[PDB]
Paper text:
Here, we report the atomic structure of an outer membrane spanning protein complex, MtrAB, that is representative of a protein family known to transport electrons between the interior and exterior environments of phylogenetically and metabolically diverse microorganisms. MtrAB is proposed to span the outer membrane and provide electrical connection between the catabolic electron transfer network within the cell, and the electron dispersing MtrC outside the cell (Edwards et al., 2018). Within this complex, the ten heme MtrC is the cell-surface module required when solid-phase minerals serve as terminal electron acceptors (Coursolle and Gralnick, 2010, Hartshorne et al., 2007). The Gram-negative Shewanella is one of the most studied bacterial genera capable of transferring electrons out of the cell to solid-phase Fe(III) and Mn(IV) minerals in order to support anaerobic respiration (Beblawy et al., 2018, Edwards et al., 2018).
The Mtr complex from Shewanella baltica OS185 produced crystals that diffracted to a final resolution of 2.7 Å, and data were phased utilizing the anomalous signal from the 20 iron atoms of the c-type hemes. The crystal structure reveals a heterotrimeric complex that consists of two cytochromes, MtrC and MtrA, and a beta-barrel protein, MtrB, that sheathes and insulates MtrA. A network of 20 bis-His coordinated hemes spans the complex, forming an electron transfer pathway of 185 Å. Hemes A1 to A10 of MtrA are arranged such that neighboring pairs have alternating parallel and perpendicular porphyrin ring planes for which the closest edge-edge distances lie between 3.9 and 6.5 Å. Solubility of the Mtr complex in the lipidic outer membrane is conferred by MtrB, a hydrophobic barrel comprised of 26 antiparallel β strands. The interactions between MtrB and MtrA allow MtrA to be positioned across the outer membrane while insulating the MtrA hemes from the outer membrane environment, preventing non-specific reduction of membrane soluble exogenous molecules such as oxygen, which could result in the generation of reactive oxygen species that in turn lead to cellular damage (e.g., lipid peroxidation). The pore is of sufficient size to allow folded MtrA (∼80 × 30 × 35 Å) to insert into the periplasmic opening of MtrB but prevents MtrA from escaping to the cell exterior, effectively trapping it inside MtrB. At the cell surface, the surface loops of MtrB largely cover MtrA so that only MtrA residues 284 to 306 and heme A10 are presented for interaction with MtrC. Interprotein electron transfer from heme A10 is facilitated by the positioning of MtrC heme C5 within an edge-edge distance of 8 Å. In the Mtr complex, MtrC is angled on the surface of MtrAB so that the more insulated side of MtrC faces the membrane surface, while the negatively charged heme propionates face toward the environment thereby providing a suitable surface for direct electron transfer to large extracellular substrates.
Author numbering:
A (entry chain A): 62 to 73, 78 to 112, 116 to 333
B (entry chain C): 43 to 650
C (entry chain B): 47 to 695
């Protein structure tokens, strides 16, 4: 058999220097149905149902993913079927392209430019004062997310927000003797994972952050007016200047010191 | 005719217009009738810096712009307006933006004060010196967000009666007025109120000042009263803690400002360490009481039985706390309305008071025994007689070894506490006992100055806490009177151990001691009444060693030097420092109250 | 060549001045002059043997490498390398010696004082330090596929992290900024067995993490006179060596009408590091912890096509962490108690379970509507609130058909409520009765987002969207009260079919937060207003020169303004000063395909960066009870170039 002939009518371009133009393994062309698998010649085009005219791009059909799904449901394409992308009528083809050697999306220098085309918010966020080093492509969204959708809420590659942070910040994984409750519970109770005006990607910083949760009588619950005109400069005190509350409570992510309950040492 | 007693102020509109203050107000008297024709008044304007605006940890602080005095008959820099219906208004001459020292700030809470002078109305009616103030937002004239109303005049008046007595010729009677003028920039460094007042009371022994609540307590006129524990600063703490130099790091770690104090000195810590010693004291005093009985015998002796009581008043086996008794001290005399046993032997009866300690250092003393769990001791024979001398009486003081809130077995090094004293009466005839009057001096008046835990004569003696345990009379409203009648078992007409030299008789002792104290300025501070009829059962009193004076004269010369009475005293059937028989023959021949008609409110009154 | 070694390799070198080390982030490395070595080569021709190696920017940060080998469809063995490095500063000053070490010491001639303004040898002693963190991950993996169904996975990577962090060690209010060393080595391990079928597959994955800190405590001499407690030196407990292990079973049943997904997960995280006793004068109840936390997860998802007009989905998730570390009595140091205040450790347990249901009804091709309800319930330990429950309902509506316009808008409204709020006994000083920690408080979060793209002419397109969110904590009277986030964005692209492409963007965002607090530990007396805002614009031009000496070049411009402004109002209103970062980036590139088998490219970028934190614009002795690192501001213009070459081999 074989049908070695669909090729010669077509302009000898779509070089198959890539993985799906390879031949050795029992998947794609050899020991398989060749340009049939992705297009479909029971009786080839120039002849809608049971016919050989598979479009495959940003253009004509939609929900065509069916075809590559017969072939690719590994551990990572699970939850794709209700995925924010699938339900957005996004297609495997709008991201990936097969008909050229090595796919651009899997260069990590570029996986951003593709994702930021729709997710315009992130293109602001990684220009902010602090953020993960995506601008110059030391990292990209694949490090945190899986674009095919995960069972976790914002399609994170790990089963919860904190164990996706721990893949790189293991220093901060438990269990510590005296842990700060918010840190253990959810890391983005304080941090914005894409970027922030404030340093260390904090939603709010220095004293007011702590004063959102700490209301005990005394120095934790006073008004720190800062620059005032009447005498109080902003960098002349340990509460608003320097590292604010962390000049005395530096272990904000928890302590394993016998006397660390107040996050002091 | 009815000269105005009280001026009561209501503010209707108070604001700052382009930097010039304006007040419009209503004045009414003690029966809520308008007061019309006011002649002289001083107007003052001020500004409040909030907590922290000067620096983290610093307190709120007034800025005093200045004062203007308006006299309707003479000069007045501003515009004073009488609506001749009780309503008034004043507009200042000063413009706050033009102040050399203070930048007027439209956003700071503002305050305006009024001293209404004692100038009488045009129609001749008397006006009492008065003071009022108002707190307002500069533009809207509404109630401000914040304040500094920490202490209240009521608390000072517990001891001072009227704050005007204290300073500046009576001009100022409300503590908020002082608090506003005595701020940084207006007075010298060290005279700011948060330091001045502490400093003028730190070195006083008054028991009530041992706790911050004599001045810092919850009170409707003080929404900020709690700052006393929440605003620790070098100036205010150092006002009592003068040995520390925070900037130098002497006696304390270095503190170059007040940013950090509150971090270490939280409210609860400041509070307990300054209220705890008083609380412990009350906690230990509360655990034991005493009831005593005293029974006259046919051989002129007296059996005294002392019963120690639990927290609820039920008697206990005394051996259970014998090991905790440092000293149970008794004093027995005869004739409560006029003791006839001296401290030493009396010229008349020839008898000295019966002084016996029932327990010293955990041990029963000679002649004391335990019966039904009670202490018993029988006196030597006493000079029982008729009438008042039918009654013997005994004063009882208890001093227990303690630790914190605990009573502990007494050791050589052991702290002590004076407990509730007891007073006991008994007769030879078996008839009802005579008792001295309590209706002229209530011990409650003392508590104001000396606390409810005045351990009188702690030190050389067991100490005496005067409570209703000694009470035997009630007042108009039906409440128990605690009198100081027990004291006369020692402070006899014949003096104490110097027999006249220190003027020991109780009719004189408190007067001499307290006439020399500038806080004491009116007899109303101890006296709700004078019981002049009491002199009718008095004899002569020892006024120097071995020599005696008729009682009315003796009482008056506690303060009044005998020589300084222009009209002379022997003229009046008085005898001043004569011998015993001569003086007590003349005891009832004194003519003073034919002329002198004294009240606690004015004791200099006379009728000729 | 299709058979045999084939591909391309390249090199590069670049230069940068000046020496302010923030420039090192835009550049490849920190060094004055860069080094680069790109590659992409491939081998085949041995009965399906294939053997590729690829290398991105190796010799500098962001560097990567991947070599593979084996038989195309039976097995593959790879080895990898990655390098990340972020540079923070080289302007900080510390009097401590032994920086980068376990032990920070002052000169033996040092004179303590009660404050930094009065330490005679502080200025004289200050030596410069560089804050920065570098990661080196080297990995290795085997991958064996089977004939029919079963394939296996096994991989192992080791990261070595080095550099310095900012830390604070002091005694009560005396504080010193210290260079916390970081020499971490964290291992990761993966192993998996998958059985795949026509319309189903099961996986069994093991994941393992192992953190090893070289140093376990940080020792430092006190610059200050000894204060109450009488200490000359501190000892901070560093992040302890820990480890975590987990296995997840997953199952997928595919089918044209329905699909079912499931995930089962069990793990344990452990920590047994010995406890710090230096500079600690009380008896520890144990010389070492045996802290263990047990993780369990359960994930269920069904998606079915009830008709072709609409698709119905449901989900369920459950993630429970139970810390059953062992409680004991720990003597805390206290300024009020000389003998220490005793405190019990509180091992926090966290459970989460969510249930959700959705519907995707396509009224019409080009017009899809979606609606869903999500329920979440979180249970917690030792805290103000036991349980918190949120009910959120949402919808999204997309419309592509009409003209060249393509639109969609989505809105969600969620209400969080919970059990009785009542402050914990486990704090050292009880909080205000009115405080509501925002992660626990009743909230109403409503957000709406709309986006439109229109392309009337071909060779141009314009997209713009707008977002608005509001977290409103209705019953919070002390604490976080409200946080609203609004964003705009507009991007455009076009060409007169000129074969040069252009684009331009502007994005704007403001997050406005608003909180209250109470000085007299009662009802509020002050309020805080924080405004966290960003403006970023840029435009680029790119020209591919076709049918000639295959040149291609481009020019890119971007400007950002990150800015924070916070204000506190108690009686009056104060504010914190300048908090901003303003940066211009221009990138000019051009490549010439000279010599056919080779190609050369030239990059040139300018970075004008200026940042200021008004709180840290002070000197070292700037606050009396703290020893600082100094001014951190940056204002520098960086001029960077690089050459690159690639030869076909
Ligand atoms: C000539 C006799 C052809 C044979 C044999 C095959 N194809 Fe083709 N095809 C042909 C032409 C002239 C074109 C261009 C169509 C146009 O509009 O210009 C195409 C197009 C395709 C496409 C792209 C469809 C599109 O996007 O317009 C595909 C995917 C395609 N052809 C696939 C295909 C397959 C799989 C064949 C063998 C099984 C095959 N073609 C044969 C002409 C001819
Ligand atoms: C972006 C919107 C994507 C769409 C849609 C799809 N894929 Fe994707 N894929 C994408 C990225 C960014 C990567 C990088 C690898 C990573 O770490 O995430 C991948 C990877 C793949 C792979 C390789 C193995 C893997 O990563 O799991 C495969 C086999 C793959 N993608 C297939 C695939 C299918 C079948 C898709 C649609 C149903 C699909 N991809 C969509 C980005 C995106
Ligand atoms: C507030 C209650 C926080 C929670 C929850 C988390 N972090 Fe955090 N983080 C917080 C602050 C106030 C800072 C500033 C530190 C400084 O020196 O100014 C940080 C910083 C980080 C950092 C940078 C420095 C650090 O100590 O490593 C990282 C890498 C970081 N945070 C990570 C992190 C993770 C992994 C958390 C949960 C898993 C997390 N943070 C929670 C405050 C808070
Ligand atoms: C202005 C409107 C005043 C008010 C009302 C009160 N005081 Fe005053 N006092 C005032 C001044 C300018 C001074 C002089 C001190 C200085 O150097 O500026 C004083 C002084 C006193 C003092 C003694 C001060 C000393 O130098 O040791 C005392 C004890 C005092 N004042 C008390 C006091 C009281 C009790 C007040 C109202 C009940 C009061 N002052 C009001 C100005 C003003
Ligand atoms: C009357 C003799 C007092 C004694 C006893 C105590 N305090 Fe006092 N305090 C007193 C006054 C008249 C004032 C100033 C009020 C004003 O309106 O300016 C104060 C003030 C304080 C403060 C300052 C609070 C603040 O500035 O916001 C503190 C911290 C304070 N006082 C403490 C304090 C303590 C602990 C006391 C007993 C140990 C104490 N004071 C007694 C008057 C008197
Ligand atoms: C003997 C057992 C006494 C009893 C009971 C009470 N007092 Fe006394 N008091 C006593 C002596 C021996 C002296 C010293 C000599 C003298 O007469 O002054 C005192 C002194 C005082 C004083 C003077 C001030 C002083 O030196 O501390 C006062 C104000 C005083 N006594 C009061 C007092 C009161 C109120 C008592 C019962 C309520 C009381 N005394 C009982 C001996 C004895
Ligand atoms: C305590 C601080 C005193 C004040 C001030 C003044 N007096 Fe007093 N007085 C005091 C005591 C303890 C007693 C003795 C009570 C007893 O049981 O013996 C007295 C007594 C008198 C009396 C005798 C009348 C009586 O009620 O027993 C007189 C006439 C008297 N005091 C006058 C007086 C005057 C005029 C005072 C102020 C000018 C005054 N006392 C102040 C205690 C105190
Ligand atoms: C030194 C200059 C400090 C700074 C700045 C801050 N805190 Fe603090 N804090 C400090 C000390 C000495 C203590 C008590 C030490 C002891 O042994 O008691 C504390 C304590 C706390 C606490 C617990 C006590 C309490 O008030 O509940 C909390 C919750 C706390 N500190 C919080 C806190 C906040 C929120 C800060 C900035 C907003 C802050 N601290 C700064 C010393 C210092
Ligand atoms: C699996 C994936 C395949 C296979 C095995 C073939 N095609 Fe072909 N096709 C596929 C995709 C994903 C796309 C769109 C995205 C992309 O191009 O990468 C296409 C589209 C085409 C086209 C359009 C023009 C173009 O490629 O630019 C043509 C002409 C085409 N497909 C033809 C073709 C031939 C002749 C094939 C076997 C020799 C063949 N395809 C296989 C997906 C896949
Ligand atoms: C959100 C919720 C926060 C925020 C933003 C911060 N903390 Fe805390 N913190 C939080 C909880 C739930 C707890 C446990 C005690 C409690 O239930 O209130 C803590 C604990 C602390 C402690 C221990 C104090 C004690 O035991 O009494 C400290 C010293 C502390 N947190 C400091 C701190 C700092 C400095 C913060 C901002 C930089 C901060 N917290 C924020 C919850 C939250
Ligand atoms: C008025 C008198 C004050 C002032 C305004 C403050 N103190 Fe403070 N204090 C005072 C006394 C008479 C005593 C002795 C109490 C006793 O031991 O019975 C104290 C004691 C302290 C202590 C105890 C330390 C010691 O000496 O053993 C401390 C820490 C203390 N006082 C602190 C303190 C602070 C922080 C103050 C300002 C808010 C403060 N005092 C004011 C008397 C007075
Ligand atoms: C950190 C610890 C500080 C903070 C920053 C301040 N103090 Fe203050 N203080 C502290 C201790 C541990 C002690 C000793 C208590 C005791 O011995 O029981 C004190 C003592 C005082 C005193 C008492 C004076 C005496 O010893 O007789 C005062 C008046 C005092 N402290 C006040 C104070 C002030 C005004 C502060 C900053 C403006 C301040 N302290 C800061 C602990 C610490
Ligand atoms: Ca009785
Ligand atoms: Ca005498
Ligand atoms: Ca280690
Ligand atoms: Ca548990």
């Amino acid at each position: 058999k074989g049908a070695d002939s669909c090729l010669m009518c077509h302009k000898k371009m779509d070089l198959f220097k890539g993985v799906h133009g390879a031949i050795d393994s029992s998947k794609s062309p050899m020991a398989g149905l060749q340009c049939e698998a992705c297009h479909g010649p029971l009786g080839q085009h120039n002849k809608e149902p049971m016919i050989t005219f598979g479009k495959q791009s940003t253009l004509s059909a939609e929900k065509q993913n069916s075809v590559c799904m017969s072939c690719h449901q590994d551990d990572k394409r699970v939850s794709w079927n209700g995925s924010h992308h699938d339900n957005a009528d996004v297609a495997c083809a709008s991201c990936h392209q097969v008909h050229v050697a090595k796919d651009p999306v899997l260069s990590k220098n570029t996986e951003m430019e593709v994702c930021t085309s729709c997710h315009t918010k992130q293109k602001a966020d990684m220009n902010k004062r602090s953020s993960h080093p995506l601008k110059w492509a030391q990292m990209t969204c694949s490090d945190c997310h899986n674009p095919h959708g995960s069972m976790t809420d914002s399609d994170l590659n790990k089963p919860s927000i904190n164990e996706t942070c721990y893949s790189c910040h293991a220093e901060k994984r438990g269990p510590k003797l005296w842990e700060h409750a918010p840190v253990t519970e959810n890391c983005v109770t304080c941090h914005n994972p894409h970027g922030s005006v404030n340093d260390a990607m904090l939603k709010t910083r220095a004293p007011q952050l702590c004063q959102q949760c700490h209301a005990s009588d005394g120095h934790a619950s006073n008004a720190y007016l800062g620059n005032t005109g009447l005498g109080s400069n902003v960098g002349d005190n340990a509460f608003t200047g320097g590292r604010s509350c962390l000049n005395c409570h530096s272990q904000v992510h928890g302590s394993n010191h016998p006397s660390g309950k107040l996050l002091q040492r | 005719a009815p000269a105005i007693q009280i001026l009561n102020f209501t503010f209707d509109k108070s604001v700052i217009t382009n930097g010039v203050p304006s007040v419009e107000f209503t004045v009414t008297n003690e029966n809520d009738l308008p007061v019309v024709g006011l002649q002289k008044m001083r107007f003052a304007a001020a500004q409040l810096i909030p907590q922290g605006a000067t620096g983290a940890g610093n307190a709120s602080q007034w800025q005093y712009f200045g004062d203007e005095t308006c006299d309707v008959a003479a000069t007045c820099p501003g515009t004073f307006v009488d609506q001749k219906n009780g309503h008034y208004s004043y507009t200042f001459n000063m413009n706050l933006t033009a102040n050399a020292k203070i930048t007027y700030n439209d956003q700071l809470a503002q305050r305006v004060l009024i001293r209404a002078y004692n100038t009488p109305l045009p129609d001749g009616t008397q006006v009492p010196n008065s003071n009022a103030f108002v707190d307002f937002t500069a533009d809207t004239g509404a109630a401000p967000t914040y304040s500094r109303k920490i202490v209240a005049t009521e608390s000072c008046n517990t001891c001072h009666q009227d704050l005007a007595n204290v300073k500046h010729g009576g001009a100022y009677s409300d503590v908020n007025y002082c608090a506003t003028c005595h701020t940084a920039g207006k007075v010298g460094v060290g005279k700011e109120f948060n330091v001045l007042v502490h400093a003028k009371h730190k070195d006083l022994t008054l028991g009530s000042l041992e706790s911050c609540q004599s001045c810092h307590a919850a009170n409707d006129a003080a929404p900020d009263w709690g700052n006393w524990s929440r605003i620790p600063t070098a100036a205010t703490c150092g006002s009592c803690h003068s040995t520390v130099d925070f900037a130098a790091g002497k006696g304390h770690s270095q503190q170059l400002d007040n940013s950090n104090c509150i971090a270490c000195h939280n409210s609860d810590w400041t509070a307990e360490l300054h209220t705890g010693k008083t609380a412990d004291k009350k906690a230990v005093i509360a655990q034991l009481g005493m009831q005593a009985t005293l029974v006259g015998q046919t051989d002129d002796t007296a059996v005294l039985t002392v019963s120690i009581l639990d927290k609820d008043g039920n008697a206990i086996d005394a051996a259970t706390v014998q090991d905790k008794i440092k000293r149970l001290e008794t004093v027995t005399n005869v004739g409560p309305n006029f003791p006839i046993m001296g401290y030493n032997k009396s010229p008349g009866s020839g008898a000295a008071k019966i002084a016996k300690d029932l327990v010293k250092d955990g041990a029963l003393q000679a002649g004391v025994t335990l019966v039904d769990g009670k202490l018993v001791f029988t006196t030597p024979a006493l000079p029982f007689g008729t009438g008042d001398t039918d009654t013997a009486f005994t004063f009882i003081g208890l001093e227990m070894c303690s630790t914190g809130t605990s009573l502990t077995a007494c050791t050589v090094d052991s702290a002590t506490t004076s407990m509730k004293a007891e007073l006991a009466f008994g007769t030879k005839s078996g008839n009802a006992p005579s008792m001295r009057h309590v209706n002229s001096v209530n011990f409650s008046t003392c508590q104001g100055c000396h606390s409810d835990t005045f351990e009188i004569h702690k030190g050389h003696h067991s100490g005496f806490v005067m409570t209703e345990q000694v009470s035997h009379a009630k007042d108009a409203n039906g409440k128990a009177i605690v009198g100081v009648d027990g004291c006369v078992a020692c402070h006899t007409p014949d003096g104490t151990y110097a027999s006249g030299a220190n003027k020991g008789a109780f009719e004189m002792k408190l007067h001499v001691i307290h006439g020399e104290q500038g806080v004491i300025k009116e007899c109303t501070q101890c006296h709700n009444d004078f019981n002049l009829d009491a002199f009718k059962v008095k004899g002569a009193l020892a006024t120097s060693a071995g020599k005696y004076t008729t009682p009315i004269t003796a009482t008056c010369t506690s303060c009044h030097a005998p020589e300084s009475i222009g009209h002379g005293l022997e003229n009046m059937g008085a005898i001043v420092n004569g011998d015993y028989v001569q003086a007590n023959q003349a005891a009832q021949s004194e003519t003073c109250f034919y002329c002198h008609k004294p009240t606690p409110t004015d004791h200099t009154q006379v009728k000729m | 060549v299709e058979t045999g070694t084939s591909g391309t390799v390249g090199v590069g070198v670049g230069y940068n001045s000046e020496e302010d080390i923030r420039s090192a982030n835009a550049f490849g490395t920190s060094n004055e002059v860069a080094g680069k070595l790109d590659a992409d080569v491939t081998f085949r021709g041995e009965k399906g043997y294939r053997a590729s190696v690829e290398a991105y920017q190796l010799g500098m940060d962001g560097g990567r490498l991947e070599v593979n080998a084996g038989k195309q469809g039976q097995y593959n063995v790879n080895v990898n390398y990655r390098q990340i490095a972020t540079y923070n500063s080289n302007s900080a000053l510390t009097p401590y010696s032994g920086v980068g070490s376990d032990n920070l010491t002052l000169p033996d001639n040092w004179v303590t004082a009660g404050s930094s303004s009065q330490m005679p040898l502080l200025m004289d002693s200050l030596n410069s330090l560089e804050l920065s963190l570098k990661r080196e991950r080297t990995g290795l993996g085997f991958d064996y596929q089977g004939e029919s169904l079963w394939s296996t996975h096994v991989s192992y990577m080791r990261e070595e992290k080095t550099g310095l962090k900012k830390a604070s060690g002091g005694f009560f209010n005396q504080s010193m900024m210290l260079a916390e060393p970081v020499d971490y080595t964290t291992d990761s391990i993966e192993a998996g067995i998958k059985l795949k079928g026509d319309n189903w597959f099961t996986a069994l994955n093991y994941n393992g993490s192992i953190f090893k800190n070289e140093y376990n405590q940080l020792n430092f001499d006190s610059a200050f006179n000894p204060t109450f407690g009488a200490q000359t030196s501190g000892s901070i407990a560093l992040d302890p060596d820990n480890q975590s292990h987990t296995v997840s079973l997953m199952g997928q049943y595919n089918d044209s009408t329905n699909v079912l997904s499931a995930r089962l997960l069990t793990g344990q995280m452990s920590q047994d590091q010995a406890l710090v006793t230096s500079g600690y004068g009380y008896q520890v109840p144990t010389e070492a912890l045996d802290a263990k936390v047990d993780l369990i997860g359960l994930n269920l998802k069904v998606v079915s096509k009830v008709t072709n007009s609409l698709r119905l989905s449901g989900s369920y998730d459950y993630n429970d962490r139970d810390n059953n570390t062992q409680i004991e009595e720990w003597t805390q140091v206290s300024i009020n108690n000389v003998n220490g205040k005793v405190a019990y450790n509180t091992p926090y347990d966290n459970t989460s379970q969510r249930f959700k249901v959705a519907a995707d009804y396509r009224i019409t091709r080009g017009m899809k509507l979606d609606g869903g309800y999500d329920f979440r319930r979180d249970e917690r330990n030792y805290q103000d609130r036991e349980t918190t429950d949120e009910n959120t309902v949402w919808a999204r509506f997309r419309v592509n058909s009409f003209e060249t316009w393509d639109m969609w808008v989505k809105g969600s409204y969620g209400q969080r409520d919970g059990s009785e709020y009542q402050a914990s006994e486990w704090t050292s000083s009880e909080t205000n009765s009115l405080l509501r920690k925002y992660n626990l408080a009743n909230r109403d979060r409503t957000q709406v987002e709309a986006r439109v793209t229109h392309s009337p002419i071909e060779s141009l397109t314009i997209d713009f969207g707008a977002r608005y969110a509001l977290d409103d904590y209705t019953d919070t009277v002390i604490g976080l009260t409200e946080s609203k986030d609004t964003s705009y964005d507009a991007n455009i692209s076009y060409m007169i079919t000129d074969d040069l492409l252009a684009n331009a963007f502007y994005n704007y965002q403001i997050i406005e937060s608003e909180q209250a607090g109470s000085s007299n530990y009662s009802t509020p007396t002050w309020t805080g207003f924080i405004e966290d805002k960003v403006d970023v614009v840029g435009a680029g031009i790119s020209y591919n020169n076709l049918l000639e000496n295959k040149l291609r070049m481009g020019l890119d411009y971007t400007y950002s303004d990150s800015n924070s402004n916070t204000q506190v109002r108690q009686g009056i209103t104060g504010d914190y000063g300048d908090y901003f970062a303003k940066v211009h980036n221009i990138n000019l590139y051009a490549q010439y395909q000279a010599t056919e088998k080779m190609a050369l490219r030239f990059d040139y970028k300018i970075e004008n960066y200026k940042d200021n934190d008004a709180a840290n614009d002070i000197a070292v002795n700037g606050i009396w009870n703290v020893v600082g690192f100094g001014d951190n501001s940056h204002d520098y213009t960086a001029q960077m170039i690089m050459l690159s070459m690639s030869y076909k081999i």
